[PDB]
């Protein structure tokens, strides 16, 4: 519901946005030529929202806040070196992605060694990403019999805060 700010000073254009904190979007304007005058805008989420991040069809980062009740909040394994997972159906039936972002206790995005997605039943590879605080699955045909497992392997700190949401383009 809370969107990044797309407006920029004259001579500048919106370029991308990232989750600066779990509760703060950060948007970036760019000038031509590039300069240090470029407007960077921080947008707070509402307290019931969490910032989620993914890459758009053009490769640019896009961040926005979604109500936590509208996605899956989960904890990564207590032992950072243990891969832990959660499973999610998405309504209605159809082709959707999942995205996942991981935060540490200070509400900072934290890179994890591996985020992997498995279509179920069958443990079908639906995407593997590494050394990243966020990562999205392939486009997967969800249905009453088809759902998706998301696995996080931190490789460092455990008990991290993960958020898994669904999206389409």
């Amino acid at each position: 519901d809370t969107l990044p700010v797309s407006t920029c000073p004259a001579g500048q254009k919106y370029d991308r946005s990232v989750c600066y904190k779990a509760d703060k979007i950060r948007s970036f304007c760019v000038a031509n030529p590039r300069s240090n005058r470029e407007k960077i805008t921080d947008t707070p989420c509402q307290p019931r929202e969490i910032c989620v991040q993914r890459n758009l069809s053009n490769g640019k980062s896009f961040a926005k806040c979604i109500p936590i009740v509208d996605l899956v909040e989960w904890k990564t394994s207590a032992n950072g070196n243990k891969e832990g997972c959660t499973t999610t159906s998405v309504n209605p039936a159809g082709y959707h992605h999942l995205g996942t972002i991981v935060y540490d206790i200070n509400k900072n995005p934290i890179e994890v060694d591996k985020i992997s997605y498995f279509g179920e039943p069958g443990n079908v590879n639906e995407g593997i990403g590494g050394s990243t605080s966020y990562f999205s699955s392939d486009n997967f045909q969800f249905s009453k019999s088809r759902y998706m497992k998301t696995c996080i392997f931190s490789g460092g700190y455990g008990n991290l805060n993960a958020y898994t949401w669904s999206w389409e383009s």
């Binding site: 969107l3 990044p4 797309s6 919106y14 946005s17 989620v52 758009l56 069809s57 053009n58 896009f62 926005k64 979604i66 109500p67 509208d70 996605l71 899956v72 959660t86 499973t87 999610t88 159906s89 998405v90 309504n91 959707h96 179920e120 759902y147 998706m148 949401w165 669904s166 999206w167 389409e168 383009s169």
Partner: peptide, 18 residues
């Protein structure tokens, strides 16, 4: 069966994803 069911599907506004 899955542990969770999602009932909200995010789509980026056109002004960001043309």
């Amino acid at each position: 069966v899955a542990e969770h069911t999602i009932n909200y599907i995010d789509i980026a506004p056109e002004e960001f994803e043309p």
